Amino acid sequence: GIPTELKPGTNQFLTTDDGVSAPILPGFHPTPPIHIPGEVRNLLEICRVETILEVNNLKTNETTPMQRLCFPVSVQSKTGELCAAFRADPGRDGPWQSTILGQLCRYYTQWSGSLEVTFMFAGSFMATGKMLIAYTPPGGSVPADRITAMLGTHVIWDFGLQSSVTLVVPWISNTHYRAHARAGYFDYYTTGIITIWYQTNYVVPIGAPTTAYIVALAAAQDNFTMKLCKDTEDIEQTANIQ
Amino acid sequence: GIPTELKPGTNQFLTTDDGVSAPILPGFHPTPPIHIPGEVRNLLEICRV
Amino acid sequence: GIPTELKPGTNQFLTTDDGVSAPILPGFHPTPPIHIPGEVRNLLEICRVETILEVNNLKTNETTPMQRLCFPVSVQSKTGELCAAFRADPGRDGPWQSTILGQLCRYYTQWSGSLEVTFMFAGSFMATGKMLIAYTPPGGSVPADRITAMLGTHVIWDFGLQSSVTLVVPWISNTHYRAHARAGYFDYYTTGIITIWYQTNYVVPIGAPTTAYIVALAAAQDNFTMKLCKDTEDIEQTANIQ
Amino acid sequence: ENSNSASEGSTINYTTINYYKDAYAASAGRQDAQLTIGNSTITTQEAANIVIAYGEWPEYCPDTDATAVDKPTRPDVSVNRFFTLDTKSWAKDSKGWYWKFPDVLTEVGVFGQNAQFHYLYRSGFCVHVQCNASKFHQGALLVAVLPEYVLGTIAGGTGNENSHPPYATTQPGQVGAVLTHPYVLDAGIPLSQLTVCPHQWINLRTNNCATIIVPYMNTVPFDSALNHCNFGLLVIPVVPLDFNAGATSEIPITVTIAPMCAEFAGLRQAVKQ
Amino acid sequence: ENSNSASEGSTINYTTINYYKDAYAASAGRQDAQLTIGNSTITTQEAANIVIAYGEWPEYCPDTDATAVDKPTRPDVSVNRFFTLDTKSWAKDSKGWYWKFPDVLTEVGVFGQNAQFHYLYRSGFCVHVQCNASKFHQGALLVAVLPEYVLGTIAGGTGNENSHPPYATTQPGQVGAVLTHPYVLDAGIPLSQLTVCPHQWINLRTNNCATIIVPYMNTVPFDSALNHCNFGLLVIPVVPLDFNAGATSEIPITVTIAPMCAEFAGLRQAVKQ
Amino acid sequence: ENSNSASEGSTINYTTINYYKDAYAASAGRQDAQLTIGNSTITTQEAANIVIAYGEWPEYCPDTDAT
Amino acid sequence: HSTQETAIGNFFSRAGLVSIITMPTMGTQNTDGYANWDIDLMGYAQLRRKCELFTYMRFDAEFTFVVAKPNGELVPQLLQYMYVPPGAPKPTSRDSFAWQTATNPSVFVKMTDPPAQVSVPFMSPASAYQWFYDGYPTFGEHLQANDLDYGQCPNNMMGTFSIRTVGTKKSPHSITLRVYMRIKHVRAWIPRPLRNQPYLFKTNPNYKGNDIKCTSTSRDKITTL
Amino acid sequence: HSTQETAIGNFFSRAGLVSIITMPTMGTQNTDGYANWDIDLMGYAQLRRKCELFTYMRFDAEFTFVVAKPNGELVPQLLQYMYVPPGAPKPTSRDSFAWQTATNPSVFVKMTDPPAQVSVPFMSPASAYQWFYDGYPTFGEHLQANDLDYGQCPNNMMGTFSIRTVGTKKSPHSITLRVYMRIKHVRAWIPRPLRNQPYLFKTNPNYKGNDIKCTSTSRDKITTL
Numbered sequence A, C: 001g002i003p004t005e006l007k008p009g010t011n012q013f014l015t016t017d018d019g020v021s022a023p024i025l026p027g028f029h030p031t032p033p034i035h036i037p038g039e040v041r042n043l044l045e046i047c048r049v050e051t052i053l054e055v056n057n058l059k060t061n062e063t064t065p066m067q068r069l070c071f072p073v074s075v076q077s078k079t080g081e082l083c084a085a086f087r088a089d090p091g092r093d094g095p096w097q098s099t100i101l102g103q104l105c106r107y108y109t110q111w112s113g114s115l116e117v118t119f120m121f122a123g124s125f126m127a128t129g130k131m132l133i134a135y136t137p138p139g140g141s142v143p144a145d146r147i148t149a150m151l152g153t154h155v156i157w158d159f160g161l162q163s164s165v166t167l168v169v170p171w172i173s174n175t176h177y178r179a180h181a182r183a184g185y186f187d188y189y190t191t192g193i194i195t196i197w198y199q200t201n202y203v204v205p206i207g208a209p210t211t212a213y214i215v216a217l218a219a220a221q222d223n224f225t226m227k228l229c230k231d232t233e234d235i236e237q238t239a240n241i242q
Numbered sequence B: 001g002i003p004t005e006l007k008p009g010t011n012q013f014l015t016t017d018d019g020v021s022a023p024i025l026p027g028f029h030p031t032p033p034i035h036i037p038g039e040v041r042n043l044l045e046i047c048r049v
Numbered sequence D, E: 001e002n003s004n005s006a007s008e009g010s011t012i013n014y015t016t017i018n019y020y021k022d023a024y025a026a027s028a029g030r031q032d033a034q035l036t037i038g039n040s041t042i043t044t045q046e047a048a049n050i051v052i053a054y055g056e057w058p059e060y061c062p063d064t065d066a067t068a069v070d071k072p073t074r075p076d077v078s079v080n081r082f083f084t085l086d087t088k089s090w091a092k093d094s095k096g097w098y099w100k101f102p103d104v105l106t107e108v109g110v111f112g113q114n115a116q117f118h119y120l121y122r123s124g125f126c127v128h129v130q131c132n133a134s135k136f137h138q139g140a141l142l143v144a145v146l147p148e149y150v151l152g153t154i155a156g157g158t159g160n161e162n163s164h165p166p167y168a169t170t171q172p173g174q175v176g177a178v179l180t181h182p183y184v185l186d187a188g189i190p191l192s193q194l195t196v197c198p199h200q201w202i203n204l205r206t207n208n209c210a211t212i213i214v215p216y217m218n219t220v221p222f223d224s225a226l227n228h229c230n231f232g233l234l235v236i237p238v239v240p241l242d243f244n245a246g247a248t249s250e251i252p253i254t255v256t257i258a259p260m261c262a263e264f265a266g267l268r269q270a271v272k273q
Numbered sequence F: 001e002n003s004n005s006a007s008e009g010s011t012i013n014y015t016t017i018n019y020y021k022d023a024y025a026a027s028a029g030r031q032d033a034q035l036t037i038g039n040s041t042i043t044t045q046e047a048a049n050i051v052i053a054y055g056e057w058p059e060y061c062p063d064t065d066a067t
Numbered sequence G, H: 001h002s003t004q005e006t007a008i009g010n011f012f013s014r015a016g017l018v019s020i021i022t023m024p025t026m027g028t029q030n031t032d033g034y035a036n037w038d039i040d041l042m043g044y045a046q047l048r049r050k051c052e053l054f055t056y057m058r059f060d061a062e063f064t065f066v067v068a069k070p071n072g073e074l075v076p077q078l079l080q081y082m083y084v085p086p087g088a089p090k091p092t093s094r095d096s097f098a099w100q101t102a103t104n105p106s107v108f109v110k111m112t113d114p115p116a117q118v119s120v121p122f123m124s125p126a127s128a129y130q131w132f133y134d135g136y137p138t139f140g141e142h143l144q145a146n147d148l149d150y151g152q153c154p155n156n157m158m159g160t161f162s163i164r165t166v167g168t169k170k171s172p173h174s175i176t177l178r179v180y181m182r183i184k185h186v187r188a189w190i191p192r193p194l195r196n197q198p199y200l201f202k203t204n205p206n207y208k209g210n211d212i213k214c215t216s217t218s219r220d221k222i223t224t225l
């Protein structure tokens, strides 16, 4: 016989190893496939669709989860109140867990590419006003005033003739990839802070409601890339499945 | 010798696995066949009667 | 199946054996590299740079290690005093342990090629004089006088207009390679003795210090070659690393 | 190397090494507007542009995938037309409603009668939703199409009881049914992820209408119309409509649907359910 | 055979046999003067020739390795210029000083202000040291550049205590800090091996000046200027200066530095530390 | 493949696979009257024809096999 | 940056635990020496959450059978595997006629040998596996007692898997089996939302009504991070 | 004379001991049946001195896992390996959900089988590993209690490695694991001096202040050999 040499690693099973096994049904011919709509060959196509991002999350809204989908806006008596603020990291515990982007991002460790956040105005047609949506690069805290937040990337948008605004989050990083940023020592990977600010005011005529709700959407772009698959925290077994 | 690597599934017997075994009669020459009527190569011909 | 034949050496692990194992991350694409200065593909480039050689090593200088980097020179009342002497073997316990050449040479057993030793004059600009730096081939002891040391390879150098001198140690050997010379039976591999001698005198004007220090440098040349990697004595574990 | 494998029916090619005669035992390898349909018509001037579900138009079953030897009927005019359903009165606490296709039209028109006399069913659908409001009304509706929408059960709230939803909830009929916990959609799945499937937003300040064209999606070319429900329709008031006192409080929601490219087979007796 | 490997980004080729689809699981195989910068200028007639660190000049970040989508600022005149620091009085027992770049210039000039408003930082540096002496003075200084210079701690001298150096020693600022045990450089590493890195000798009998051009060296193209210190600067009096009585005992050490090819990105708020 | 084997001195050829340098360690393979002599003479008229043992006549030793 | 990692080929292909089967010596269940396990892959939570991304799925499966004693040690015990297609006789005992292995595939492996590997083609009569089936498999009326048939796709039951120890006498050593699967040659359709609620039952996606877990964490104020 | 021996390819490529992990039956630590070991290669002195020649280093790693009983003998015990990337669940027990091996790689090996070998690519998000990091990973002020973050490169923590014995019952035999690494496809930069002082702590290069060992031997007189 042919002389053979055994090496370490024999008689082991690697779960990620792609091998060739023995068929139990010689020449088995399955059913011929048909044309089924919606063929998805890559998980990126699911990350590129706009999904609802929940900006408002409170301990008082745990009884009514439906209030998580939007945040209120009304008439202000002062200048430059902070409407909302949230982290820009999709793989961090927080608002990004509601979108399909963060859920599929938790399967992976290192992520890269630029993202986008879309706001939707559900208010009345005759209610006008303007908002200032700013993005602060890493290293900044929650800006105290509007003069502090404007120092970064911001956008100005109107209520009346447009129903949506898209804030493109640019890719600003020291490394080509970002691991998921967690508490403490892992804050080095934080993407930034997305703050929305009152620019002018919420103006409403007589006969229309003075309180409106804004729906926030979030998705990825064509340059978005992930790698290094892993387990997530979003499924748990405390008991057997009956 | 040639370096080899063992994979799971060694030392097993699969009943449907089609292998190659060692002959017990080297160069054994059976009896030459003749022409027998009714040669059936597929079970469908029996289902069609 | 294909007839196979097992040979002795199966189910063993050789630490120096270069094999092929199974990947745990199919098609994993790492981060694209960038241009980082100082790419070193061979350990010889580190051995060819001049590093400080400590000629003066005494039990009284153990409290002040900074005095090891140089040896004093002053005015002499007699003819031909021996300033310093040291072994020429880079892999022997002694002065050569301070240079990066000897440290990287301890990883290896058999070494070959010609070396070089550089002296630096840190004295005053107006102080003049001359030195005799000689190299004795193997078999000689420490020369008692200057007439004995001159019989080998020597060089004459001046203080005033030159700040450095390089003594090239030629390759004189019976064998193409030299194993590290240790005490007793292993003295067969000794390279030689490098002795520095007072040639004329240390002449200094009035107003300048009469005591100067000389810094010694050591490195290798392009013909320097090593082989047969091994463990060194310069790292020890007497306890676990907390 | 015979071709028995599962990936050999697609248009993508893969490289793989195989030491046996079956290709499925091999390894993985390198990876590489006015709409007039039939006798009925509609004109939507306030509506957003038509959203084609999964970018494919409904079409007749090709002979390549068709496993039936019968020659199907194509009653173009008596089958495919706009069918208007009942209106749903909106309220501030309204949780939303859902319909099960094609169970809604089983009792209505020629489409419903021929569906009872035929065992095999394939058609595409046309989804249209109508919600009217004035300039003083602020609200948002989410109209989405989720294929294979399965109803869950709270299991009494404890979780130790095994219970299934009855035929009234799983087969609401023409009138439809109302959601209980819209957050999980009674599927145990988030509402924020519903937009992954084809969807359209109805915002009362801009578009008061919605149109979605959903083709036939199943693992089989033909299937029984009575038992199998293809996809559901979800009209969810994400943003509650707000209006001050004196405004009209009755806001209807009208849903009209139409089949597209219907093929029936297996003419049989009268079968209700 | 896809190209996933680690050695496939270099210019050297290797031969290797691989039985799998990943190249990283394969085997090893066969192995194969007057300087005017910006608004400031200097003329050094006593200085030795300029020593280029690792034989590369500082240059702008190429688009191949650049991962940032922002367009960086290049304030050529207000950023890159000679910056003179405080002078260090030499004494016979002086153990030497060390500075942490780029932490020295964070408080100085336009370079320091734009560094606080920008998250990403890349630049090259110019190191220059000045020590003056007469013909009656004999001494030697060692000016070396050690990338990624980490400060250690004696751990109380016993070794059983875990302690880290505070921010005052790790970030000395513009004034700098003094060495404790110059033999180990507080790195636990020999001083005789310091010449492996780019270095220059200052010998008071010949050259009273030193010039070293150090480019940007990091595993990342851009990095935060505040937290990360690129390399340190070591001026070590190896040979103690000796002079008789009556000579001038005050010998200053002047260190002036300049940035080269600076690029800033990520304009943000004011961030001190 | 040196020729050390035992069957390599005959006129018949065999096919065999060998994984070593010696051919004897390989496998088997496919298999493929009046007579006057000198000063004396005899005449046998009643005798049957001469039977040659193993069909070979006695002959001198050739130089090939002669040691 | 390469997209090969986020593709469905590498994400769906690897080993996971679809089944846990035991044969204890003392107990009320498997102590007879054999086990009859109907094939269900949804008793395992985490791989179920991966397969619920998509409605229709077409693929092939490679299996790995690991055998060990409940304490973790091993004994020289010979085991027998057999696959029972729908309609084939299910074994009533260890000496039963069904284990005689006439036309049914079987695998023989010991406990000292490496785990057994087999390749299973696509055996479903339809074009792809249907995970969530909306409708009823049966005709006629459905009452409260017949509501169990809801969410049941007849194409998803491909057979029954069984194990036993060889020999007529009972084996003194207990055996625990762990079934593994690697998905390959996969084709996918119809993405779905990912379930945010804990699993309860195998056959249907029931959720606990008393507590509905929010998909995102909560904080004290919207303007404070 | 060939320079192939002194090249960084052959000098960096071979096996060395980066970790020692034990699972004793009686004791206060690992007796629960499982071990969670954060990945650190600097707890070993001699290979650390080899890697400290260079600042930035880019390479691949091949591993060898040797299992034996603390007395040196062997028992037929089945073991399970798993790699936990950052963010992935760390096991709280031996029956814990994390060991179920859904998307996380795992290796199965016995104690009678030869040591297991795996290949680890370059997983760091940067261009190369940074051994000595000068700075802080965190923003804002740093007090005496927060000084622990000094010398910590966030790119150097690539995950956590864990081991356990299979089965629900506790295994009566103790297990000692020795982790090995072979560096291949290596690229190097920025040479550094070789440390002449004994090691103390893993995370930072602390040296004992009372006694500073001279890098060279001492003699009585400079003129006498």
Ligand SMILES: CCCCCCCCCCCCC/C=C/[C@H](O)[C@H](N)CO
Binding pocket: A024, G039, G040, G041, G042, G061, G063, G081, G082, G083, G105, G106, G107, G118, G120, G129, G130, G131, G156, G157, G158, G161
């Ligand atoms: C030699 C023994 C081979 C044993 C073969 C057992 C066949 C198991 C095939 C599993 C592949 C998926 C089959 C169906 C999975 C889920 O349980 C179904 N959706 C059930 O609803």
Ligand SMILES: CCCCCCCCCCCCC/C=C/[C@H](O)[C@H](N)CO
Binding pocket: C024, H039, H040, H041, H042, H061, H063, H081, H082, H083, H105, H106, H107, H118, H120, H129, H130, H131, H156, H157, H158, H161
């Ligand atoms: C199937 C089990 C595989 C286990 C894989 C474990 C990954 C270990 C990779 C080691 C390669 C070097 C990683 C970092 C080394 C040093 O600890 C870091 N510098 C820590 O500072």
